[PDB]
Amino acid sequence: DVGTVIQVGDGIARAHGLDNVMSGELVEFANGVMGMALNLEENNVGIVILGPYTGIKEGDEVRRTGRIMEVPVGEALIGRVVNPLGQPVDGLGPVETTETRPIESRAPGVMDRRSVHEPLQTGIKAIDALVPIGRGQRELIIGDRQTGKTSVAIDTIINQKDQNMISIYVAIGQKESTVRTVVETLRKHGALDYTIVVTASASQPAPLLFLAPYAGVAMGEYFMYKGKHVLVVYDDLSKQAAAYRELSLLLRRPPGREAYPGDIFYLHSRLLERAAKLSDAKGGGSLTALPFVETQAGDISAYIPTNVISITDGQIFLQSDLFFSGVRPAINAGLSVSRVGGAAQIKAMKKVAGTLRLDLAAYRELEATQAKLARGARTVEVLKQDLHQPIPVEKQVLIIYALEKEFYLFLDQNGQHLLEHIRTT
Amino acid sequence: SDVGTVIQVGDGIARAHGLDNVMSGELVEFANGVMGMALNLEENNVGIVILGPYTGIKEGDEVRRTGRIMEVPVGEALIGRVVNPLGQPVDGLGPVETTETRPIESRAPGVMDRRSVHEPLQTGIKAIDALVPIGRGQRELIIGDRQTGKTSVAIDTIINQKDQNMISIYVAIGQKESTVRTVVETLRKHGALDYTIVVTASASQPAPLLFLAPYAGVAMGEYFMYKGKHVLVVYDDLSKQAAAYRELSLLLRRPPGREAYPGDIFYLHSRLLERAAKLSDAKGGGSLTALPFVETQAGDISAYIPTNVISITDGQIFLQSDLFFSGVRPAINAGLSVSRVGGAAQIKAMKKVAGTLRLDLAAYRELEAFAQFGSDLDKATQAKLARGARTVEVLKQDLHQPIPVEKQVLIIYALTRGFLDDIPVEDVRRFEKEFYLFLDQNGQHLLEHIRTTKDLPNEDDLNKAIEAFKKTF
Amino acid sequence: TRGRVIQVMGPVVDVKFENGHLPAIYNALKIQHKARNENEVDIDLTLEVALHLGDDTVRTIAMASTDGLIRGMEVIDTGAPISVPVGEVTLGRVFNVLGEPIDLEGDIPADARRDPIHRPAPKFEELATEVEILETGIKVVDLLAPYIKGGKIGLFGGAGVGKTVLIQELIHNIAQEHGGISVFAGVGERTREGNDLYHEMKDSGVISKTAMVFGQMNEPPGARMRVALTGLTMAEYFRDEQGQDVLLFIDNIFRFTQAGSEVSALLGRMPSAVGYQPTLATEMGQLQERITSTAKGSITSIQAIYVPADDYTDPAPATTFSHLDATTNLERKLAEMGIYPAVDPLASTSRALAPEIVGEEHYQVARKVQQTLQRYKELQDIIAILGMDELSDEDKLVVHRARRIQFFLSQNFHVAEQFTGQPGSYVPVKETVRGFKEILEGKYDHLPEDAFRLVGRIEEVVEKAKAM
Amino acid sequence: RGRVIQVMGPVVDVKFENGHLPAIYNALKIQHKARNENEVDIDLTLEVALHLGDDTVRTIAMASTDGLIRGMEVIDTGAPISVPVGEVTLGRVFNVLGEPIDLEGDIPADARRDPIHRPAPKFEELATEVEILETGIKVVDLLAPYIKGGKIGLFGGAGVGKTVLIQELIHNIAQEHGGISVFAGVGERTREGNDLYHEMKDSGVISKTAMVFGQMNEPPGARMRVALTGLTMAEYFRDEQGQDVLLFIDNIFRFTQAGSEVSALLGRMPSAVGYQPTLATEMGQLQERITSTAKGSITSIQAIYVPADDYTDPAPATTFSHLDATTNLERKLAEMGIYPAVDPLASTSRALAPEIVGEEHYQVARKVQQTLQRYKELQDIIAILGMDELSDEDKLVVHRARRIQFFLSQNFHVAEQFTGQPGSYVPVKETVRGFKEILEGKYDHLPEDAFRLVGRIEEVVEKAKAMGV
Numbered sequence A: 001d002v003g004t005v006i007q008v009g010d011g012i013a014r015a016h017g018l019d020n021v022m023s024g025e026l027v028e029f030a031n032g033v034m035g036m037a038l039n040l041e042e043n044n045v046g047i048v049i050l051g052p053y054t055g056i057k058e059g060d061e062v063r064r065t066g067r068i069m070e071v072p073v074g075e076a077l078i079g080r081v082v083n084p085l086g087q088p089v090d091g092l093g094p095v096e097t098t099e100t101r102p103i104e105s106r107a108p109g110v111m112d113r114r115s116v117h118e119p120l121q122t123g124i125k126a127i128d129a130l131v132p133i134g135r136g137q138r139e140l141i142i143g144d145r146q147t148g149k150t151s152v153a154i155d156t157i158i159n160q161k162d163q164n165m166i167s168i169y170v171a172i173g174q175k176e177s178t179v180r181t182v183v184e185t186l187r188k189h190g191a192l193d194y195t196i197v198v199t200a201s202a203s204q205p206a207p208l209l210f211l212a213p214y215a216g217v218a219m220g221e222y223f224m225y226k227g228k229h230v231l232v233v234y235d236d237l238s239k240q241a242a243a244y245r246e247l248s249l250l251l252r253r254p255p256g257r258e259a260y261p262g263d264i265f266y267l268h269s270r271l272l273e274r275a276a277k278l279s280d281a282k283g284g285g286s287l288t289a290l291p292f293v294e295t296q297a298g299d300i301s302a303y304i305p306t307n308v309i310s311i312t313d314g315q316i317f318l319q320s321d322l323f324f325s326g327v328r329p330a331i332n333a334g335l336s337v338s339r340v341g342g343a344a345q346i347k348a349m350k351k352v353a354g355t356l357r358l359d360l361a362a363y364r365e366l367e368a369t370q371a372k373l374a375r376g377a378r379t380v381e382v383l384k385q386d387l388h389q390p391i392p393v394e395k396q397v398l399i400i401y402a403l404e405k406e407f408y409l410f411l412d413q414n415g416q417h418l419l420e421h422i423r424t425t
Numbered sequence B: 001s002d003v004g005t006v007i008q009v010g011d012g013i014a015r016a017h018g019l020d021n022v023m024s025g026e027l028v029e030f031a032n033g034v035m036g037m038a039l040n041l042e043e044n045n046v047g048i049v050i051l052g053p054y055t056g057i058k059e060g061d062e063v064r065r066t067g068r069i070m071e072v073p074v075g076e077a078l079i080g081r082v083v084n085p086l087g088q089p090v091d092g093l094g095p096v097e098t099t100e101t102r103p104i105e106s107r108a109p110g111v112m113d114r115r116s117v118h119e120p121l122q123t124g125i126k127a128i129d130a131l132v133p134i135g136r137g138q139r140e141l142i143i144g145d146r147q148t149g150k151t152s153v154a155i156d157t158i159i160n161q162k163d164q165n166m167i168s169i170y171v172a173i174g175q176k177e178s179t180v181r182t183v184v185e186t187l188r189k190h191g192a193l194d195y196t197i198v199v200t201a202s203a204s205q206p207a208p209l210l211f212l213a214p215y216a217g218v219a220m221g222e223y224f225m226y227k228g229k230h231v232l233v234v235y236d237d238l239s240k241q242a243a244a245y246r247e248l249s250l251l252l253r254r255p256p257g258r259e260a261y262p263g264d265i266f267y268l269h270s271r272l273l274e275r276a277a278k279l280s281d282a283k284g285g286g287s288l289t290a291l292p293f294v295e296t297q298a299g300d301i302s303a304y305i306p307t308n309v310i311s312i313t314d315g316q317i318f319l320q321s322d323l324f325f326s327g328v329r330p331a332i333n334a335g336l337s338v339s340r341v342g343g344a345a346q347i348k349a350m351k352k353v354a355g356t357l358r359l360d361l362a363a364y365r366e367l368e369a370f371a372q373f374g375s376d377l378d379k380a381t382q383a384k385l386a387r388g389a390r391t392v393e394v395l396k397q398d399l400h401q402p403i404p405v406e407k408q409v410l411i412i413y414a415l416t417r418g419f420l421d422d423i424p425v426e427d428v429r430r431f432e433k434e435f436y437l438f439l440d441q442n443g444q445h446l447l448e449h450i451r452t453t454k455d456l457p458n459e460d461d462l463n464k465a466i467e468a469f470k471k472t473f
Numbered sequence C: 001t002r003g004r005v006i007q008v009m010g011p012v013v014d015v016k017f018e019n020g021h022l023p024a025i026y027n028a029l030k031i032q033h034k035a036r037n038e039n040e041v042d043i044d045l046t047l048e049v050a051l052h053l054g055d056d057t058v059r060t061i062a063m064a065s066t067d068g069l070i071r072g073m074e075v076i077d078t079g080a081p082i083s084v085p086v087g088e089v090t091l092g093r094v095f096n097v098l099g100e101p102i103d104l105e106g107d108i109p110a111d112a113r114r115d116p117i118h119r120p121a122p123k124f125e126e127l128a129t130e131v132e133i134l135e136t137g138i139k140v141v142d143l144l145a146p147y148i149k150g151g152k153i154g155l156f157g158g159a160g161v162g163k164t165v166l167i168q169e170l171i172h173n174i175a176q177e178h179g180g181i182s183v184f185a186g187v188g189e190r191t192r193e194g195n196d197l198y199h200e201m202k203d204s205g206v207i208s209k210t211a212m213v214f215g216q217m218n219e220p221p222g223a224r225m226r227v228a229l230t231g232l233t234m235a236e237y238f239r240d241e242q243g244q245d246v247l248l249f250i251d252n253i254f255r256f257t258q259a260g261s262e263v264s265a266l267l268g269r270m271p272s273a274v275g276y277q278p279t280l281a282t283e284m285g286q287l288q289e290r291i292t293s294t295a296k297g298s299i300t301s302i303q304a305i306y307v308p309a310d311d312y313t314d315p316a317p318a319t320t321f322s323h324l325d326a327t328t329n330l331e332r333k334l335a336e337m338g339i340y341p342a343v344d345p346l347a348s349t350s351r352a353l354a355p356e357i358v359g360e361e362h363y364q365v366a367r368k369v370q371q372t373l374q375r376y377k378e379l380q381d382i383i384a385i386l387g388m389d390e391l392s393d394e395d396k397l398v399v400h401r402a403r404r405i406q407f408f409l410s411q412n413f414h415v416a417e418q419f420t421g422q423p424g425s426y427v428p429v430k431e432t433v434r435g436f437k438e439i440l441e442g443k444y445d446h447l448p449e450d451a452f453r454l455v456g457r458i459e460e461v462v463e464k465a466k467a468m
Numbered sequence D: 001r002g003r004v005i006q007v008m009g010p011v012v013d014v015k016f017e018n019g020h021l022p023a024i025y026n027a028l029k030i031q032h033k034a035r036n037e038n039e040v041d042i043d044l045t046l047e048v049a050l051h052l053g054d055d056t057v058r059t060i061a062m063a064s065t066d067g068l069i070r071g072m073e074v075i076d077t078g079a080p081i082s083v084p085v086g087e088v089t090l091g092r093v094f095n096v097l098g099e100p101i102d103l104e105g106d107i108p109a110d111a112r113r114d115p116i117h118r119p120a121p122k123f124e125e126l127a128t129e130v131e132i133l134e135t136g137i138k139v140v141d142l143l144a145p146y147i148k149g150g151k152i153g154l155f156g157g158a159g160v161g162k163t164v165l166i167q168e169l170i171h172n173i174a175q176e177h178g179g180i181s182v183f184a185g186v187g188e189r190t191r192e193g194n195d196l197y198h199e200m201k202d203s204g205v206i207s208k209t210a211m212v213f214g215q216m217n218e219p220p221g222a223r224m225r226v227a228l229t230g231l232t233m234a235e236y237f238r239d240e241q242g243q244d245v246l247l248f249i250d251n252i253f254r255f256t257q258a259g260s261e262v263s264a265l266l267g268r269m270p271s272a273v274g275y276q277p278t279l280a281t282e283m284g285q286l287q288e289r290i291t292s293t294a295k296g297s298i299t300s301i302q303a304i305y306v307p308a309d310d311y312t313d314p315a316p317a318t319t320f321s322h323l324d325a326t327t328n329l330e331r332k333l334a335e336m337g338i339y340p341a342v343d344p345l346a347s348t349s350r351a352l353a354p355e356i357v358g359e360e361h362y363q364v365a366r367k368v369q370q371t372l373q374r375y376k377e378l379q380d381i382i383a384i385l386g387m388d389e390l391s392d393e394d395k396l397v398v399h400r401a402r403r404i405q406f407f408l409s410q411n412f413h414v415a416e417q418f419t420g421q422p423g424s425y426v427p428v429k430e431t432v433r434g435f436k437e438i439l440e441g442k443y444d445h446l447p448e449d450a451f452r453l454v455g456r457i458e459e460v461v462e463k464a465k466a467m468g469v
């Protein structure tokens, strides 16, 4: 059950003699570089390299591991930084695990899920009040360069500290320096006490960038099927789509609308459909997802953005008017819509702030009714936000209901007689 | 050498071995009786296009050459029926009793076998009948966006041919069967079925039937053309025929072209359309008038098939969505429409007024862009704008409401002579209604003179009739 | 007549039948293999034959994940296409592609009647053509493009414009109060949407007269290709063998075309325009022509069609436009403005909008509304360049009434509760026509335009105005 | 003798002996009598397009390929398509193959037949001798004069008037200059071909013209070689007869599209908007044989269809690089009654300079161009504001500009078919005299309709008298 490599290109090889290789298996190259068997033909087997392919040459033997595409998982991954194959990349030694999960596992059926019943308190005013996110939602963060998307993800993971929810950060194609900075930011805020980080930098081959979010989803699946709650962030799904386009074109597959393959929808779909809120019979676990998409010139009607919007349960459009317009993070509420809606919020928030989004959309339309315009500008200014500090919802609901840092200090410094009532309900 | 074994079956095509003596375009028969056309002939492989349900054909099944080019049965029995490209009826009205066949691929009449087209095909649509005249033997394309009035215009044309000996054929290609059935029933309600043949090639039919449908329709039309009768053939979309032929070529592994369309796609349309001709008295006066249809996506007439069909035809009627939604019915772009037959296909009375109408519309199209300032424009510009508004109200018509040629001539005469410059614009349609009744009450002599002499009557009597009606109005 | 797997790809598998007994096209094949040692994985997979090749070989499209497939694996031939269980058993149940229940309500009895999913469409002498207005209660739909009972309706939309919400309101307004039978087929939609709709159907007491088929985005291309055919078979038995009125909902019929395009290149077919299948139109027609009314019974079919990259000129929506009686076009620009259902008042047209079908008053008011909106759209450029004051008085009135109409064409949805906290509304066609006739007349000129958004009948507009 | 091995539509692959292969562009004949009742008689002509190796050539059909059977013998003629040339050619209608498609007999076998593929005349065989060719059309003779040996392109849309203008050029030149004319029906409409033949025959130009029709319903190879056939006839007439010879080509656009379709059928990768990669080479190989040499001259007039008013399309843009004079036919003028709908400002000529046409001619043409440009600029102001707002000079310039605008239109000898009015022929000297008189203010008192459709300014005076002025 060993073969000899007959071709090796830009991270894609073709081997000869792997008679019993299962589709999607794992194969070992002579120098210890992992690979995944993609296509099986009459005489040769197509392999995709998952690491440095420069050391692999024609004639090098390849062995069969006998295992499908899997990633290690367990409790030891908490606080660690690993590549898509689960091998640690930080200088903190190895990761000792016992269980493995398949990369391409089937999503839960239509009877295994339930409606989103509980909130995922991100800790940002507009996200937690205007575009609510639940514990089983797949909420897409979409925007141009800068625009503070990674900042939103970091604040989410930081605020999940008091919550009893595991968090996962998947870095696709991001600069390894930026990933290091984000990891150290999570360390300084204690977020690594519950967070796993999966990294696949730009210098890495396209297959690893393509494979990383599947590894993150499986890592979260281990905790969700165990009854725990997970939050998974893909640092850019656009870069994963580009990596998959490259990997497909190297395989001589004809392209589609924007040179992307035909699978470029399905590729994301079978990913974001593994994020679900399981029923009470299935243990009650959940896996929230926060895909990231980068838009060229803020054009959302492009191909990959519309694919991901078709797949996710809403979107948050962070428009570029942040660092030359202020009021960051600005929200294009006429487009940032949460499809789960008021079921995600608490009763108080749903009561107080159920009308903000329509008012904002109408105000943006009319800026193409003096009282309406005044109130709309007030609704724009009230949702101003601060730095990477989470803000709790309990003292923010009444601040929203007022229509305010002076209100923020006045509400709590005069006692918690208003705080505890909503902290309990 | 007359029998082979199919070695590949798939997706509406087949590849066979050993049909050594088969001709290009021949017919072949499979073990289950399903016909096929041997299109691609290669070194050790024959490409067959499947003319039926191909699910029953498996690899290794026998295939036998028939030594016969496709022939469509044709006769006077087909009139009033609905058939498929093979000529088999699709309604429950029993078999068609024809007794002669015509080859589906036949030569068009030569250069010397034709005659300059001179007798008008009266559409009944005032905009077409005036500004885009059509004559018997012409090839006129109707091109527009989806849901703009192509099929409605063709159906109104077929409706108008009741008392004109003007036999019609309607090739419904690519339309869903419910649409074709609705078309048939609405033709029947207005009595067109007494002189109409309908060829049906719906979407679920195998793509070669879609490809062959216009060939079958024109083959049926040529039979009546050669007997001195006048024939009208309407293809409800040549775009879908082009799509089906491209699908066949791509499956048959033929090199793509401009938009994956085959290299010979132009040929495929041209040799079809140029089969519509008007013959000289030596061959008989019988003629064939073609009305190909083309759908443009973003009003983009710059594509491959639209450009080809525009090049072939003797004129193009451009239907615009923005005109359809603005209340202009049937939304004919008289500014971008062309007719290379022109006055040769009009009554003399119609010509004398249509020239002035074209001049008026040309003047009006020069002042549309200034209408943004129209409140405070020049007196002459305002007069031209008012005349253009009255004209665009006059040219407005309703669905399934053909107008006789004499009344079209009279209303255009009233418009051009300036009798409508006093009435308000929104009333023009009502005018165009009531005046017509007025004619049928009193102006019967004028209509009879126009119908007999094919020329405008005495102008002072016409002016007196107009003045009398304006007093009545 | 066992076969052997020779090649394995993602969604397609090649099989070899060396005994010279090949399956027909669309025949079902079974991989049922148990791991003989620790280095294999037990597999239970269904394949659908698509093409024949030389030397006793067939190209098939697998119906589930192909991971774990090994060359040389044994193949069983079922001798027939995918037969789904049909009849009374389907009512109140949920099935996957293969007609196997997934609702945890028990296994369908083996001896139940099964029907193949591949059959030719009804012939010309069989279809029944007749236009009767189907009242949905949605103002813009029932006014500017009324739906036909027994016809075919298409909700064309981009990503996140309101296709699924509109489907839910059509189910809540139409399927609940209709005494026929209903079938919902989720083709390439979200599993969350399927589960939520299933719960909404059960707690409303309508699941008792409904069957469901679910093959979603998480499933391979073959599943998304054949979900529509399975649901069509289920509805077609009710239409033909029972003669009952049927309501067939398909939340994304575009995913069938998309999944056919995904496997197009691997099957061995040259790319067509925009990389679609060469046989896009034929494959779509072989499906859409089966969705039709017959002299045996009517089928009211509502399909939501996804528009890639918000481009209506894409080959799939363009080819689909010729298969539908009524068409609803959902616009992203209208959605961004808060106008829901974001129905394009101009580009959406239906065969039923005729003076003899909906009456003269309805036709007149609908055409006047469309003319006013088109005039406003054309005037928008002049307003942008010159301004508002430079417009004439007639153009100012046109802009006024056009803004009023465009706002008033929106209405609060029932399914919008969780998105708005506001109860839904049901507007009779008479109320819609009366309201728009009064708007055009100028009866409600003085009311601020804000009162016309997300409203029910015309009196609800003045009621909202009292709140200001 | 070869044998056909592959048939894919209008493309035929023929296998020959191991060493006796035909050359490229060589003509092959398939003449097969039906051996049984299951087949049909075949009379087909192919042109060797390229070589595949293994003693196989790929060829393009000039007739319908239906009915071909693999294995039937192919005759290798050993030379490209041969075409009858000379006296026998005159007054006849031929197809791409030189076979006369008229009913007036046929061509004898023992006659001189020239190949249609030949290298263009060399550098030292050329002759640059600029001389104006008088056509009789006022606007053309004034604002865009033609030259002997030049290539004059008539660009236009769908109904502008290119074919009627070609008809007048044929008729006027035949009746006045007595020159030999050749007509190449490239992608010719059988209806328009019939009309052209009838109007040639009725007016007596039949004896001064030889028509070559490549029918629109013919395979692309025929439609893209019929231009070369007409060029071969014209080149014989230039060389062996000496006097100037004119070559009119139906539409260059249809020749470029025939070439594009031929390339696509052969399987070559498309360029630009799907066009053939070798488009420039083919257009050059056509237009470079139309040159004036030491023996004689060939003037060429070619109509070019511009799709969707896209002048950046490869066919018109590539044609622009060979045309000494380009005339733009505008639909806007045609709808106004101005014929030949020649755009005065977009029409350019190589020979609109004093050194070729004289100081008076150039000055008059430039003054007319300036007046028309000023009127075009003043269009918006006269449309919005009244004519009173214009100054006296602006009033005068518009006053004269309308007169010139109508005066450039002339009654057509062929338009008697359409409008019945007899046509006219205007000498260049009288043309410039009339335009100079118009610009001098001698006729500012004549109403503009007098200049609507006439030949000479004296005819303008006569028409003004006719209306009762």
Ligand SMILES: Nc1ncnc2c1ncn2[C@@H]1O[C@H](COP(=O)(O)OP(=O)(O)NP(=O)(O)O)[C@@H](O)[C@H]1O
Binding pocket: A144, A145, A146, A147, A148, A149, A150, A151, A152, A328, A329, A385, A386, A387
């Ligand atoms: N509310 C805020 N106030 C001030 N600065 C902010 C705020 N939110 C984000 N930033 C800054 O914005 C910058 C970009 O943040 P980041 O989240 O990395 O954007 P991004 O989505 O990652 N763009 P990219 O680098 O291409 O991934 C960082 O320097 C943040 O410190």
Ligand SMILES: Nc1ncnc2c1ncn2[C@@H]1O[C@H](COP(=O)(O)OP(=O)(O)NP(=O)(O)O)[C@@H](O)[C@H]1O
Binding pocket: B145, B146, B147, B148, B149, B150, B151, B152, B153, B329, B330, B397, B398, B399, B400, C321, C322, C350, C351, C353, C354
């Ligand atoms: N002259 C007219 N006046 C008013 N309404 C019209 C007119 N012509 C067509 N319509 C309407 O427009 C609709 C479109 O019909 P149709 O003529 O088939 O358009 P189309 O060009 O065929 N688009 P399609 O059939 O989908 O390719 C008809 O059903 C009528 O309701």
Ligand SMILES: Nc1ncnc2c1ncn2[C@@H]1O[C@H](COP(=O)(O)OP(=O)(O)NP(=O)(O)O)[C@@H](O)[C@H]1O
Binding pocket: A309, A310, A311, A337, A338, A339, C157, C158, C159, C160, C161, C162, C163, C164, C165, C166, C306, C340, C341, C411, C412, C413, C416, C419, C420
């Ligand atoms: N009447 C309405 N009132 C308020 N919001 C609405 C209304 N109709 C639709 N929406 C919003 O429209 C958004 C789009 O949701 P959805 O209906 O799923 O779009 P979609 O077309 O199904 N996306 P997809 O199916 O993946 O192509 C939702 O977030 C709703 O809140």
Ligand SMILES: Nc1ncnc2c1ncn2[C@@H]1O[C@H](COP(=O)(O)OP(=O)(O)O)[C@@H](O)[C@H]1O
Binding pocket: B339, B340, B341, B342, B343, D156, D157, D158, D159, D160, D161, D162, D163, D164, D165, D339, D340, D412, D415, D418, D419
């Ligand atoms: N000189 C003219 N006088 C009157 N009518 C003309 C004249 N030239 C063209 N036309 C009209 O315009 C049409 C132009 O046709 P044609 O010139 O063949 O188109 P194209 O220029 O595209 O070849 C003719 O059918 C004729 O009716």
Ligand SMILES: [Mg+2]
Binding pocket: B150, B151, B152, B236
């Ligand atoms: Mg139509």
Ligand SMILES: [Mg+2]
Binding pocket: C163, C164, C165, C189, C193
């Ligand atoms: Mg949806």
Ligand SMILES: [Mg+2]
Binding pocket: D162, D163
């Ligand atoms: Mg022409």
